Amino acid sequence: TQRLKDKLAVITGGANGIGRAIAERFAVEGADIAIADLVPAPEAEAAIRNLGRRVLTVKCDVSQPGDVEAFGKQVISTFGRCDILVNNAGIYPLIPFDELTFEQWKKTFEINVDSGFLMAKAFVPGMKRNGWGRIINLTSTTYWLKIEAYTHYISTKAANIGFTRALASDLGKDGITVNAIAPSLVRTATTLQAIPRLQVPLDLTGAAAFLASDDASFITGQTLAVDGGMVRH
Amino acid sequence: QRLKDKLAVITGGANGIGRAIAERFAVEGADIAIADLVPAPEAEAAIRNLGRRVLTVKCDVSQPGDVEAFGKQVISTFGRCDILVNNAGIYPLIPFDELTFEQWKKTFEINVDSGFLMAKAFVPGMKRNGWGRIINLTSTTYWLKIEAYTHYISTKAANIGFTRALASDLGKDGITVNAIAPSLVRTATTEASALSAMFDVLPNMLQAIPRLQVPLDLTGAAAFLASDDASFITGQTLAVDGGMVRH
Amino acid sequence: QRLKDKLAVITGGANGIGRAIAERFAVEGADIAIADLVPAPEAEAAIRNLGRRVLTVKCDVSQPGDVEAFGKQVISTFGRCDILVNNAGIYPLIPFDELTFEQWKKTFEINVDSGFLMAKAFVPGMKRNGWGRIINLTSTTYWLKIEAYTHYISTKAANIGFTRALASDLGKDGITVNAIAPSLVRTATTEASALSAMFDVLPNMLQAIPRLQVPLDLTGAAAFLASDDASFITGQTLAVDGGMVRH
Amino acid sequence: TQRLKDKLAVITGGANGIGRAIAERFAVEGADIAIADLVPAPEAEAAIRNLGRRVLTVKCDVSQPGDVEAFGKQVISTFGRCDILVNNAGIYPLIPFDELTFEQWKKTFEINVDSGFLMAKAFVPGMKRNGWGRIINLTSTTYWLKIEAYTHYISTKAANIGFTRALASDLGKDGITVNAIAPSLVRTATTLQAIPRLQVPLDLTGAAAFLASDDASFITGQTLAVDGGMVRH
Ligand SMILES: NC(=O)c1ccc[n+]([C@@H]2O[C@H](COP(=O)([O-])OP(=O)(O)OC[C@H]3O[C@@H](n4cnc5c(N)ncnc54)[C@H](O)[C@@H]3O)[C@@H](O)[C@H]2O)c1
Ligand SMILES: NC(=O)c1ccc[n+]([C@@H]2O[C@H](COP(=O)([O-])OP(=O)(O)OC[C@H]3O[C@@H](n4cnc5c(N)ncnc54)[C@H](O)[C@@H]3O)[C@@H](O)[C@H]2O)c1
Ligand SMILES: NC(=O)c1ccc[n+]([C@@H]2O[C@H](COP(=O)([O-])OP(=O)(O)OC[C@H]3O[C@@H](n4cnc5c(N)ncnc54)[C@H](O)[C@@H]3O)[C@@H](O)[C@H]2O)c1
Ligand SMILES: NC(=O)c1ccc[n+]([C@@H]2O[C@H](COP(=O)([O-])OP(=O)(O)OC[C@H]3O[C@@H](n4cnc5c(N)ncnc54)[C@H](O)[C@@H]3O)[C@@H](O)[C@H]2O)c1
CB A188 less than 6 A from any atom of ligand 1: yes
Closest CB to C96 among B150, B153, B169 = B169
Interacting residues of B111 by C-beta distance below 8 A, sequence separation 6+: B88, B89, B90, B152, B155, B156, B158, B159
CA distances D174 to A9, B148, C53, C215, Å, are 47, 46, 40, 22
* Residue C188, number of CB atoms within 10 A of its CB: 11
Shortest Cα distance from B180 to chain D (angstroms)?
17
B246, A221 contact by CB (below 8 A): yes
By C-alpha distance, which of C6, C222, C244, C46 is closest to C145? C244
Question: Using CA atoms, how far apart are residues C246 and B177, in angstroms rounded to an integer?
Answer: 22
* Residue B45, number of CB atoms within 10 A of its CB: 11
Tally the C-alpha atoms within 13 A of residue D110's C-alpha that lie toward its C-beta. 14
- Give the CA angle between residues B51, B56, B58 to the nearest 5°: 170
**Ligand of minimum distance to the alpha carbon of D156:** 4
- Asked: is B1-247 a CATH 3.40.50.970 domain? The reply is no
Beta pairing, strands A84-87 & A223-226: unpaired
Question: Using CA atoms, how far apart are residues D233 and C173, in angstroms rounded to an integer?
Answer: 23
Best of A94, A110, A140 for a ligand 1 pocket test (most atoms within 8 Å of beta carbon): A140
Burial environment of residue A183 by CB neighbours within 10 A (0 to 12, 13 to 18, 19 or more)? buried
CA distances D102 to A62, A100, A113, D153, Å, are 13, 25, 12, 13
Please give the CATH superfamily to which domain A1-233 belongs.
NAD(P)-binding Rossmann-like Domain (3.40.50.720)
D211, D177 contact by CB (below 8 A): yes
Interacting residues of A188 by C-beta distance below 8 A, sequence separation 6+: A16, A17, A18, A201
Burial environment of residue B37 by CB neighbours within 10 A (0 to 12, 13 to 18, 19 or more)? middle
Chain D residues with beta carbon closer than 8 angstroms to that of C210: 172-173
Question: Using CA atoms, how far apart are residues B95 and B113, in angstroms rounded to an integer?
Answer: 23
Q: Tell me, what amino acid is at C88?
A: A
Q: How far is CA B240 from the centre of its chain?
A: 13
Handedness of CA A207, A212, A216, A219 (dihedral sign): positive
Number of H helices, E strands in chain B: 9, 7
Please report the beta strands in chain D, taking only residues with DSSP state E, as ranges in sequence order.
Answer: 8-12, 32-37, 55-59, 84-87, 133-138, 176-183, 223-226
Q: b/e per residue, C5-24, with b = 16+ CB within 10 A?
A: ebbbbbbbbbbbbbbbbbbb
Q: Is B219 on the interface with A (CB under 8 A)?
A: yes
Beta pairing, strands A8-12 & A32-37: parallel
Beta pairing, strands B6-11 & B30-36: parallel
The end-to-end CA distance of chain D, in Å, is 32
Q: Is A149 on the interface with C (CB under 8 A)?
A: no
Write the DSSP assignment of C41-69 as a string of letters: HHHHHHHHTTT--EEEEE--TT-HHHHHH
C14, C36 contact by CB (below 8 A): yes
CB A154 less than 6 A from any atom of ligand 1: no
Beta pairing, strands A133-138 & D55-59: unpaired
CA of B17 to the centre of ligand 2 (A): 7
D221, D179 contact by CB (below 8 A): yes
C130, C173 contact by CB (below 8 A): yes
Q: Do A229 and C142 touch (CB under 8 A)?
A: no
Tally the C-alpha atoms within 13 A of residue D219's C-alpha that lie toward its C-beta. 33
Handedness of CA B245, C111, C123, C218 (dihedral sign): negative
Q: Tell me, what amino acid is at D79?
A: F
Tally the C-alpha atoms within 13 A of residue C125's C-alpha that lie toward its C-beta. 22
Closest CB to D169 among A102, A148, A163 = A148
Question: Using CA atoms, how far apart are residues D145 and A84, in angstroms rounded to an integer?
Answer: 25
Question: Using CA atoms, how far apart are residues D130 and A199, in angstroms rounded to an integer?
Answer: 42
Residue nearest to atom 12 of ligand 4 (CA): D90
Residue in chain B lying closest to C95 (CA): B169
Closest CB to B160 among C151, C157, C162 = C157
* Residue D214, number of CB atoms within 10 A of its CB: 10
Please report the beta strands in chain C, taking only residues with DSSP state E, as ranges in sequence order.
Answer: 6-11, 30-36, 54-58, 83-86, 132-137, 175-182, 237-240
B44, B96 contact by CB (below 8 A): no
Handedness of CA D214, D219, D223, D226 (dihedral sign): negative
* Residue D148, number of CB atoms within 10 A of its CB: 16
Question: Using CA atoms, how far apart are residues C24 and C19, in angstroms rounded to an integer?
Answer: 9
Q: b/e per residue, D103-141, with b = 16+ CB within 10 A?
A: eebbebbbbbbbbbbbbbbbbbebbbeeebbbbbbbbbb
Cα-flanking dihedrals φ and ψ of residue D137, to 5°?
-110, 135
Experimental method reported for this structure: X-ray
Question: Using CA atoms, how far apart are residues B48 and D122, in angstroms rounded to an integer?
Answer: 71
Question: Using CA atoms, how far apart are residues C155 and D132, in angstroms rounded to an integer?
Answer: 37
Q: Do D170 and A149 touch (CB under 8 A)?
A: yes
Angle, helices B101-108 vs B150-170, to 10°: value is 30
Question: Using CA atoms, how far apart are residues B86 and A184, in angstroms rounded to an integer?
Answer: 28
Binding-site residues, ligand 4, Cβ < 6 A: D 12-13, 15-19, 36-39, 60-63, 88-92, 111, 138, 140, 157, 183, 185-186, 188-191
Q: Is C239 on the interface with D (CB under 8 A)?
A: yes
Q: Is A193 on the interface with C (CB under 8 A)?
A: yes
Cα-flanking dihedrals φ and ψ of residue D96, to 5°?
-55, 145
CB A63 less than 6 A from any atom of ligand 1: yes
B152 is catalytic: yes
The radius of gyration of chain B from alpha carbons, rounded to an integer in Å, stands at 17
B34, B7 contact by CB (below 8 A): no
CA distances C165 to B148, C162, C236, Å, are 8, 5, 11
Q: b/e per residue, D152-166, with b = 16+ CB within 10 A?
A: bbbbbbbbbbbbbbb
Angle, helices A115-130 vs A151-171, to 10°: value is 20
Interface of D with A in 74-103 (CB under 8 A): 96-97, 100, 102
Question: Per residue, what are the HEC states of A140-200?
Answer: CHHHHCCCCCCHHHHHHHHHHHHHHHHHHHHHHHHCEEEEEEEECCECCCCCCCCCCCCEC
CA of C13 to the centre of ligand 3 (A): 8
